[PDB]
């Protein structure tokens, strides 16, 4: 019942869209497994990234965009709602002005739009997790 | 013909041992896939690490040890013999005073022993690679 990782799915997003991801780190937090979610402008993996979300479990989260191939201003958070050894549910909601990232139902990170979410054509979920669910939903 | 990743194998090392690893990154270098090789003191993943070798492909390599659960002095190298999109052969040779890391036959990194290599009981290879070969050999 596991999805392949790296996991890539075509996607369209607008205000009211939510990307929901259920999975589990492949290692204990002492080993610093990573999780990465990238919202890309094209299906190709080297395409620009409207929203990059990277967890180093137990340490920090970084967020950024990659525009014309170059990483822009990095944002860092030390908020760490993820729990060592546990399955997590991560949801990324598209609001008018930002993405909101919920972890296990708790608001945990936000990132103001640098590019309209309508530029997204693909989502990739990768690094040191197993994945059981990936869903894009919409509520107006 | 791919080996499972994370890949864990029991191992014993001394002067003259070589760990040889063939694999390929799972992403283009622009996406910064990682590779990690850890020489552990016990079979459990949370055990201490005599030699930690972490590649961020296209950017840098860090090396360290984890002793009584704590990371020690990080060493960083910007040497990057790995080639974007290519299979690599990595060998880690145990010398009297250090590990020598060869990449595609070229001496690329070294790390002085902080703990005797005889303390190693397990090797783990993980992060964003596919793996086709893992071998421990010995030449006196």
d(CA B111, CA A3): 38
Domain containing B29 equals 1-140
Nearest neighbour of A27 by CB, restricted to B6, B27, B30: B6
Q: Looking at beta carbons, which residues of chain B come within 8 Å of A127?
A: 34, 127-128
d(CA A17, CA B53): 40
Pairs across A and B, CB distance < 8 A: 36
d(CA A104, CA A88): 6
Q: Which of B26, B56, B32 is nearest to B131 (CA)?
A: B26
Count the Cβ atoms, other than its own, within 10 Å of residue B125. 23
Do B45 and A26 lie within an 8 Å CB cutoff?
no
Nominal resolution in Å? 1.4
Flag whether residue B24 sits within 8 Å of chain A, measured between CB atoms: no
Task: For residue A99, give the CATH number of its domain.
Answer: 2.60.120.200
Report the domain count for chain B.
Answer: 1
Contact B127, B35 (CB under 8 A): yes
Strands A98-103 and A88-94 turn out to be antiparallel
| Residue B36 burial by Cβ neighbours in a 10 Å radius (0-12, 13-18, 19+) | buried
Q: Looking at beta carbons, which residues of chain B come within 8 Å of A27?
A: 6, 45, 126
Contact B92, B16 (CB under 8 A): no
Flag whether residue B10 sits within 8 Å of chain A, measured between CB atoms: no
Q: Which two tokens mark B51?
A: 């030699």
Do B126 and A45 lie within an 8 Å CB cutoff?
no
Do A26 and B6 lie within an 8 Å CB cutoff?
yes
d(CA B103, CA B1): 22
Q: Looking at beta carbons, which residues of chain A come within 8 Å of B30?
A: 46, 66, 69
Q: Which two tokens mark A75?
A: 């944002």
Flag whether residue A12 sits within 8 Å of chain B, measured between CB atoms: no
With CA atoms as reference, the chain B residue closest to A70 would be: B30
Q: Looking at beta carbons, which residues of chain B come within 8 Å of A6?
A: 26-27, 128
Cα–chain center distance at B48: 15
Q: SS3 sequence, B35-86?
A: EEEEEECCCCCCCCEEEEEEEECCCEEEEEEEECCEECCCEEECCCCCCCCC
Q: Looking at beta carbons, which residues of chain B come within 8 Å of A31?
A: 38, 45-46
Nearest neighbour of A28 by CB, restricted to B27, B46, B126: B46
d(CA B84, CA B82): 7
Residue pointed to by tokens 């070294």: B110
Q: Looking at beta carbons, which residues of chain A come within 8 Å of B128?
A: 6, 126-127
Cβ neighbours of residue A70 closer than 8 Å, sequence gap 6 or more: none
- The reply to whether omega before B6 is within 30° of 0 (cis) is yes
Contact B84, B78 (CB under 8 A): no
Do A127 and B126 lie within an 8 Å CB cutoff?
no
Q: Looking at beta carbons, which residues of chain A come within 8 Å of B28?
A: 45-46
Do A46 and B69 lie within an 8 Å CB cutoff?
no
With CA atoms as reference, the chain B residue closest to A65 would be: B31
Q: Which of B13, B113, B8 is nearest to B67 (CA)?
A: B113
């Amino acid at each position: 019942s596991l999805l392949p990782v790296p996991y890539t799915e075509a996607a369209s997003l607008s205000t009211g869209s939510t990307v929901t991801i259920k999975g589990r780190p492949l290692a204990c937090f002492l080993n610093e497994p990573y999780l990465q979610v990238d919202f890309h402008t094209e299906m190709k993996e080297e395409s620009d990234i409207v929203f990059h979300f990277q967890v180093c479990f137990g340490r920090r989260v970084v967020m950024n965009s990659r525009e014309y191939g170059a990483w822009k201003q990095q944002v860092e958070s030390k908020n760490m709602p993820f729990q060592d050894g546990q399955e997590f549910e991560l949801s990324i909601s598209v609001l008018p002005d930002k993405y909101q990232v919920m972890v296990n139902g708790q608001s945990s990170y936000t990132f103001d739009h640098r590019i309209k979410p309508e530029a997204v054509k693909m989502v990739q979920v990768w690094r040191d997790i197993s994945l059981t669910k990936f869903n894009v939903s919409y509520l107006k």
